[PDB]
Design a protein around this nucleic acid. Structure first.
Ligand code: ZN
Ligand code: ZN
Lengths: 359, 359
DNA sequence: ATCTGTACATGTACAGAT
DNA sequence: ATCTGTACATGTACAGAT
DNA sequence: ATCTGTACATGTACAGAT
DNA sequence: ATCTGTACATGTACAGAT
């Protein structure tokens, strides 16, 4: 039933190759510029993240998420109003001049300055790329990235996310986060939290206090690992194991939301990370791989639908790494929007998903 | 039944504490001496291996296995005629004078010499410790280890194993080894084979050719990982998962073999490694954790037992990492020994294992 | 002379195409 | 199925630095 | 660069429940 | 017997400091 939809969201090798050539050229160039010659971002490191590198990119290879992560050693971290996700970054005992001293704002490290210099260097280097049609997208509020528009005949979007890497232990609001013990295990969880944690610019433009100095936690790496190692059995989806319908369900969900969101302006507040969080919670609820047999697809998909409905109705969706962070708060999303989405999803659900047959 | 046997085979944390304290003391001192007083074994590192660190040690914490591994770069391996497991170690371009100069017989690295020096150093440092009752065991032919006898009242043995470390790709005799694809998976296997391989002195005194220049592959690190990561499910034997009886069956099997070897001299060619290999192949045949339920212990045990008999019947126990290397070959164990053991095994098997019930 | 950094080699999982 | 491109891990060459 | 503070796995020991 | 919860113990990773 949903097989043909998946066969339609399935990417094509020609498109993947054609896009990745160009994307890799550009990104490598920027990485060089930022790293090689004298930047404040020297030593910055690449980390490919997002749907394309998690193998859950649908329809087209037209979105690439790339992290330029920079390690900031002695870093004092201060939570922003018990939010869980938002922090302020101070420098402990800076011994010398410090390559980020121009980005200091009062006493704290400024995300806005840093991101502006970052953006300036990217623009300058992009100007010199003569073999590819590439421009820089206008700054979007909320965005932690410098977005590039590539015309490789087709339109490809590339988010260059500026990140701060901390190698220390994760914030204490992540303690009860990442509930994968009865699913991926305790050794996997223990080894994952030994990885560094990341910080992106919040880049909110509401004018509120601090604002330009406020950072947000990122775990795109942990999520990438989880997407690549998703079974309770190590051989899941491997060449000597059984395929599950997890990633496919994720795809179907993301697609439904994409179609809906491009048909209705009332869904502007919603994004694919909401459904990603939701499917994490569904995987924690149903750890067993047999609960995700391609046998059904229909049933597990419908179950995900159901859970996300409930998330909407209760106006709750805890961050999978920060459980005191509701992504479906009234603060973030109005209940009118959520009920609207609820209605749309319900219609599509008990009407045989006609929107999948659209565009 | 077998549960009571497992109860008496279980170690006591008091004995564990008392033994480990002293063992760690001595080991640390020897390691320090090794890395410090400017030896050719400077830069040697420690790797704990064996039943104790696999939590498969039975009865008493009276045996400890420690590898002193030395990273030896730029080695050329020359197989000892189609054995798969045995090699001569030459050097590509013999780098500096290199600390291993005097251990070289032209191009080939002498094992007997390097081990003789290793041993001499260890003896000199064992002489110089007066707060522990520790001596050095007489050299066993065939043994790659300088063995220490600690008479911290209860006799403890410590094998200090001289290992060469190599970070290249594993020898091609291992290409078809480690058949864990359907059990632990392809990523686990690939990762484990990204790890270094080790070479220990064969140290036979048979008098034959290449006697003191022959090295042997060791995979004790890989085995350790496998033992502590034994399930098809990642939650196997974790706090939020279900237990299995894998390690238990290994323990019982090891115990049966120990008792039989304790009684009969006709079994001197047999070691716990035959058992370990056998159960590796068993776990590979039965990948499911539910094929190893603690409620089916007996039937699991007997199962392994039967397999062992077949390995005895067909005179074939393929090494788990080097398939072309037969452990039960005529060259290694006389047919008569391999019939004696089968007879004793069947006997104990049909009569309720009376040998378990005695000391 | 040797040492270091860059980036070319090499091997395989994932998933597309047939 | 087999074949196959990409992404990512590690190993290793060698120019150029000391 | 050698040494050291935090974190949690794996395991034993024993009592209270079932 | 069987199970389970808490106490208790060793081993191992590793960032970061000196
Ligand atoms: Zn799967
Ligand atoms: Zn287990």
């Amino acid at each position: 039933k949903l097989k043909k939809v998946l066969d339609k969201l399935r990417l094509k090798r020609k498109d993947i190759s054609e896009a990745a050539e160009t994307v890799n050229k550009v990104v490598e160039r920027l990485l060089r510029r930022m790293q090689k010659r004298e930047s404040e971002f020297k030593g910055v490191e690449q980390l490919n993240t997002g749907s394309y590198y998690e193998h859950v990119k649908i329809s087209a290879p037209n979105e690439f998420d790339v992290m330029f992560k920079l390690e900031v050693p002695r870093i004092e971290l201060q939570e922003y109003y018990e939010t869980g996700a938002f922090y302020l970054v101070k420098f402990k005992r800076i011994p010398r001049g410090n390559p980020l001293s121009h980005f200091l704002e009062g006493e704290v490290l400024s995300a806005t300055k840093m991101l502006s210099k970052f953006r300036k260097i990217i623009k300058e280097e992009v100007k010199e790329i003569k073999d590819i049609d590439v421009s820089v997208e206008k700054e979007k509020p909320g965005s932690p990235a410098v977005t590039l528009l590539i015309r490789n005949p087709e339109e490809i979007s590339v988010d260059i996310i500026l990140a701060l890497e901390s190698k220390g232990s994760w914030p204490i609001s992540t303690k009860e986060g990442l509930p994968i013990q009865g699913w991926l295990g305790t050794k996997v969880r223990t080894n994952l939290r030994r990885e560094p944690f990341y910080l992106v610019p919040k880049n909110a433009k509401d004018g509120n206090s601090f604002q330009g100095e406020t950072w947000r936690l990122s775990f795109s790496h942990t999520e990438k690992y989880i997407l690549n190692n998703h079974g309770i059995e190590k051989t899941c989806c491997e060449s000597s194991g059984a395929k599950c319908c997890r990633k496919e369900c994720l795809k179907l969900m993301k697609y439904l939301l994409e179609q809906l969101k491009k048909e209705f302006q009332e869904l502007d507040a919603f994004c694919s990370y909401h459904v990603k969080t939701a499917i994490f919670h569904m995987w924690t609820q149903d750890p067993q791989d047999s609960q995700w047999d391609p046998r059904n697809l229909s049933s597990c998909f419908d179950k995900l639908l159901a859970f996300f409905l409930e998330c909407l109705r209760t106006e709750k969706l805890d961050h999978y790494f920060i459980p005191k962070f509701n992504l479906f708060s009234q603060e973030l999303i109005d209940r009118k929007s959520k009920e609207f989405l609820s209605k749309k999803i319900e219609y599509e659900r008990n009407n045989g998903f006609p929107i999948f047959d659209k565009l």
